[PDB]
RNA sequence: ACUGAAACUGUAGUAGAACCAAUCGGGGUCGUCAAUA
């Protein structure tokens, strides 16, 4: 099945990226913002720069030069897990438990988590 | 019912002044998929 409502739909268009230089909140401001979208951008008032490490030993080579561990599973997000992405409020409250899945993207005042 | 002759369209003059190839972005991370019996 298809759930009714899109994610986009679920977002306020106050917490979407921005899609003019009026609407840029405090971190369109300090980090910077491109519009995705059409016309406008701003270089961020926050420039990161001079990244050093002190420590001249700070790598583990686990034992040898070929050693490596072999690293779980990042397995890719999954937001069709409505339990755990979708918010029963635009306030960002979960799910309520013991709902059957098409509760998720479901009505216009849910929201993402 | 006696061709005028002779005469450099040339001389001077910087396609140039101003303009940031640049703005934003963690090499990142989880549950789905198939439909019947």
Known sequence: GLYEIAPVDLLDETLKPATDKKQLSPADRVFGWVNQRGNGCYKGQLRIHSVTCQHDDAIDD??????????????????????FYCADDRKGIPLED???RDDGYSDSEQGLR
């Open 98 to 100: 013991g709902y059957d």
């Open 62 to 83: 686990f034992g040898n030069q070929n050693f490596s561990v072999p690293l779980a599973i990042l397995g890719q997000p999954k937001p069709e897990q409505a339990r």
